[PDB]
Design a binder for this molecule. Structure first.
Ligand SMILES: [Zn+2]
Ligand SMILES: [Zn+2]
Lengths: 108, 99, 148, 82, 94, 85, 99, 83, 109, 93
DNA sequence: ATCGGATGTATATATCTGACACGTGCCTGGAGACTAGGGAGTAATCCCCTTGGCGGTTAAAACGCGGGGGACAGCGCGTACGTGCGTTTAAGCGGTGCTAGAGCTGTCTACGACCAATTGAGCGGCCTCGGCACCGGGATTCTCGAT
DNA sequence: ATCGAGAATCCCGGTGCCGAGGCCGCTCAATTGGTCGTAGACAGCTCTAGCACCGCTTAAACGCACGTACGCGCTGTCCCCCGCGTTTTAACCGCCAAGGGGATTACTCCCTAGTCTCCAGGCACGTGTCAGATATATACATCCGAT
């Protein structure tokens, strides 16, 4: 890609590449840090963020609301298999639990 | 003559009500007093941010809800509907908390 | 094959419906290298300005965006000295369903209203944004040097 | 000095937690067991929180100490920073 | 003025307005998103350094990050995240 | 009742539909085009520009990408055009 | 007339025998073949150090022994002595292995 | 040189021996298939990470240290084979 | 101390202090490393090793053996309370399991 | 060739201090080496996180003390802290 | 409650073999002395936010009662699992041969760290209006005793 | 199989308020240009151990028959949670008031990194002998049918 443009818009991203480069270069990870690692890591982070935000927005719209709240975040995360497996030991504040009643308890 | 609900149909209503909400089900002042008591058992003359107490309440309530889900499954395993202390003991043993 | 079949009907669609103030065609032996001409929009300081541009089609089409460049000279926050266009349609948000007519019309739409948020050259963007009225004289000037 | 504050976790509160957990019928001997397990969990978390506080030469248990203590035990918490 | 603190608020908001143009986000949801991004950053960048200490390297490249993504994310997330990272790196270089 | 050949074209190919995939936005495209656009361009539908990443992840594991009904209708009507490919 | 034990005593004898020893209870060639089959399902033309196969066998056997302990506890909880697949499923779910 | 259906090499007596060490006195007849399925799932999960570790280092031989690293990653540390 | 002997002998330890200092320096943990961290770490490691070796030697003696094998280490770790909690997730190769039978399974009197 | 290092000789010295007449096999020695390495990694990682939290750029003895307190259970942590403090005090003078 | 076989497990003695503990060469990593500088310790000031108190109002808790449904014990059936024996299978062991790939050494070239100047991306503080909370009334839908 | 009455929940419309979205000023961190020491990429050579095949024992697996004892369904009893009404307790909200200690800033000094020289501790390799495993033969504990 052509130079003379900001690093984040050179790679087509939205998350910062300079900040990620600094964080990788200051967090006691390795002696040296490659040039392409921040781009890869920022792309992965942005992909995950958009992935969760799409489902959260859908869940918010299904409630006739126009603002994402932690309840919609957990409704999105816990209903998706890969996202639920990725965050399975994580508690989301003010999120509640999914509706689930055992079939034995229902009246006969 | 007065109207009564059969035993079991008000419990499911509460299950559906409390599974649909997100608020905290424990009163805040008693929990704060208990937290302060335990902390002063550990180290004397301690002060607490309100965010710390809120985080403790959230964590404790999430833990208790998960434990009660596991306890319910344990009780249903033995062909019951009521939950008993042996269910909690078995769930905690299998999760490895008490062993 | 696939790409050439796409380009032939793209050219046919452009020919059967000539876009207003934009024309295009093949200049080389093949259809990979194309030339085009754009006329200045009416509500712009580019009155009576002709701009020539050349485009190359990558080997994989339309899954990769084509390459556009300006042979002539124009002053623009999104166009550098070499004439390359800084448009999100051209590089980032390119959709394979987009045709050559749509992008060639979006070029003129950008000419109507330059985008200063993501400029290829920063100082030109600063000069454009600080005040339009002061620069408008230089805008016509640049038109007489090359466009006129 | 505070004493006997474990009884602020009332029977209605434990019933509400069980209802959110999906429980339909509850025996009368479950509340003391719930109080015991809650006390053990609170002691375990608060010990690490106070250790983190003491290492930093502070006198107040911030929310960061609680978040770090929860993360150290495998109970990561989202919402209070970190 | 208080000391400057950094967060991913503006970037998460840009992503949100890219995916859902007419949807906003509250403050607690933003504080949950920031924590999620921080946690995943720590996970990937910390498991990608054991991957270099194992092989007696001293540089973290885009080859350690790709493998860390492969190991940490589940089956179908690790096929899309890797593709997005490779696409971003290729776009950055050329 | 029976759809014609006008609605049986791939927007990217401008050819006959092969292994159709119908996105949640009801945009039908042939499987190779979907694979190429997913791999290279945007991970979004080329037509109305909406994100279909979660749908793709869900339906790739369970092997439900192809629209069975439309493919069944199409395959019997035009055997020769499909053979030409 | 021929001597035979009542059903159950030889099982306890085997329990006492196999809890006092430390060898591996799975034959080594079939396990090596299974490991190689899975690996070639992942990547083709792979080679295995003998220590790798040995470590895999040790880990798998330890995991199965622990899972069977949990299964036995689940079976006993339901007033039984036999272990049934629902016991394995319940132990796995409570452990979080399948959820 | 493809190998097929070798999971039957974990015979019923072997599973009975594992249960006996685990402390099981009486076994149902449907346990064996369930045990085979669980063992296959566990082996796949471990071997995937082991092969990933050996692929990163540009090798063709799956060493023991790769298996130890994978086991540590999954949360089951193993003492005896290195580390 | 005398500032003349070896670092391990100066602190009264048998575990190395120079090797621990180097391992802490080259492990990518912190930019700087103090001069008292390796001594403290070596002391802690030596204490834990001594505890486990004492318990394993006792377990070997109970078996009329004069050589610790992984079985004795497993017995020592599992039969304890703090050592079992410190090594809950650890698998010992060739260690076996602790012998026990549930009281329900034993024959009725 | 190449040289590979281990804690074998120090483990043997500690064993000879504790049980003067017992020996140790090779598999047990490998297990002990793995245990020592694992505890080293645990304590060092906890100390690194502790130093990072307080905006420090050094791992001192109190970092290791707090890490030992966080990791080891009650009596083990108490005895380990006592032993480490004694070793440091004997070292500094 | 034993008593007798009958079987399995425990105990004592010869022996022999291979792995553990010790000894030797040496070389690479750890110890010792010196210099430079930035990190952290200490003192001082600001002001934020934590603790404590009072009054009201009312939502949540505590207590008592009547009763229906669920937990638990007891019986009977039959069917699946345990024990034992004869037979078929392939694991285990030893031995030999081959070569693929892990491992080590030597060059050297391009990638990443470090330093100085500079300015715009991003953070803190303010402001405003609309999204969501709340109140009140009506429509919809389970729920249960009675047929 | 159902009809109807009492009760809980959902929709809809109108009012209000505070927090989320956007703007403005500013300062510090990311960018660009340039230089240099070394990390690792590549080529070549060694040689270790992973793979394949063959033959012989014999140990573990397999298949079949008999019986028994354990799982599972059914019935009965009783007592203990549940739903509901009345009264008591203290949680929650708004408000005021004080001061501890978290957070920031400035100065300084001393602890640690980096460099060079040197030498001995521990690592690889070789060797002898005794601890434990194996085979063999008694001694005793335990189980089951039968009085
Ligand atoms: Zn197509
Ligand atoms: Zn679309």
């Amino acid at each position: 890609s052509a130079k003379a443009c900001t690093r984040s818009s050179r790679a087509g991203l939205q998350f910062p590449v300079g900040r990620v480069h600094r964080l990788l270069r200051k967090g006691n990870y390795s002696e040296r840090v490659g040039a392409g690692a921040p781009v890869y890591l920022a792309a992965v982070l942005e992909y995950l963020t958009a992935e969760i935000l799409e489902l959260a927005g859908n869940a918010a719209r299904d409630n006739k609301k126009t603002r994402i709240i932690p309840r919609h975040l957990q409704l999105a995360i816990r209903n998706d298999e890969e996202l639920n497996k990725l965050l399975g030991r994580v508690t989301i504040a003010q999120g509640g639990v999914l509706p689930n009643i055992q079939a034995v308890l229902l009246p006969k | 003559k007065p109207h009564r609900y059969r035993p079991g149909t008000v419990a499911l209503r509460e299950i559906r009500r409390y599974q649909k909400s997100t608020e905290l089900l424990i009163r805040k002042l008693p929990f704060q007093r208990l937290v302060r008591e335990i902390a002063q058992d550990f180290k004397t003359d301690l002060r607490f941010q309100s965010s710390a107490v809120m985080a403790l309440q959230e964590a404790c309530e999430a833990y208790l809800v998960g434990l009660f889900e596991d306890t319910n499954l344990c009780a249903i395993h033995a062909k019951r509907v009521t939950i008993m202390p042996k269910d909690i003991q078995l769930a905690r043993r299998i999760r490895g908390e008490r062993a | 094959h696939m790409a050439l079949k796409r380009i032939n009907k793209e050219l046919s669609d452009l020919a059967r419906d000539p876009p207003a103030q934009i024309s295009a065609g093949p200049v080389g032996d093949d259809m990979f290298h194309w030339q085009a001409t754009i006329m200045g929009p009416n509500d712009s300081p580019y009155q009576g300005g002709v701009f020539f541009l050349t485009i190359h089609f990558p080997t994989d089409y339309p899954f990769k965006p084509p390459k556009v460049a300006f042979t002539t000279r124009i002053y623009h926050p999104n166009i550098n000295s070499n004439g390359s266009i800084c448009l999100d349609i051209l590089r980032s948000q390119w959709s394979p369903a987009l045709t050559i007519s749509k992008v060639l019309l979006s070029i003129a739409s950008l000419l109507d209203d330059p985008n200063p948020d993501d400029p290829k050259v920063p100082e030109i963007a600063r000069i454009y944004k600080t005040d339009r009225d002061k620069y408008n004289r230089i805008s016509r000037e640049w038109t007489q040097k090359y466009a006129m | 000095v505070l004493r006997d504050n474990i009884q602020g976790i009332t029977k209605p509160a434990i019933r509400r937690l069980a209802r959110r957990g999906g429980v339909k019928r509850i025996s009368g001997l479950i509340y003391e067991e719930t109080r015991g397990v809650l006390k053990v969990f609170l002691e375990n978390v608060i010990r690490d929180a106070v250790t983190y506080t003491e290492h930093a030469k502070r006198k107040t248990v911030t929310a960061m100490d609680v978040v770090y203590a929860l993360k150290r035990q495998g109970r990561t918490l989202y919402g209070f920073g970190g | 003025k208080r000391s400057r603190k950094e967060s991913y608020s503006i970037y998460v908001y840009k992503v949100l307005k890219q995916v859902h143009p007419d949807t906003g986000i509250s403050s607690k949801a933003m504080g949950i998103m920031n924590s999620f991004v921080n946690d995943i950053f720590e996970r990937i960048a910390g498991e990608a350094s054991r991957l270099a200490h194992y092989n007696k390297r001293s540089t973290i490249t885009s080859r350690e990050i790709q493998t860390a993504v492969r190991l940490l994310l589940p089956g179908e997330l690790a096929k899309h995240a890797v593709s997005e990272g490779t696409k971003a790196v290729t776009k950055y270089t050329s | 009742a029976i759809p014609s050949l006008s609605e049986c074209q791939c927007g990217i190919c401008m050819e006959i539909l092969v292994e159709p995939v119908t996105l949640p936005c009801n945009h039908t495209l042939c499987k190779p085009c979907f694979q190429s656009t997913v791999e290279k361009a945007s991970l979004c539908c080329p037509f109305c520009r909406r994100r279909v990443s979660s749908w793709t992840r869900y339906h790739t594991r369970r092997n439900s990408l192809v629209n069975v009904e439309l493919w069944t209708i199409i395959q019997k009507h035009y055997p020769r055009e499909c053979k030409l490919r």
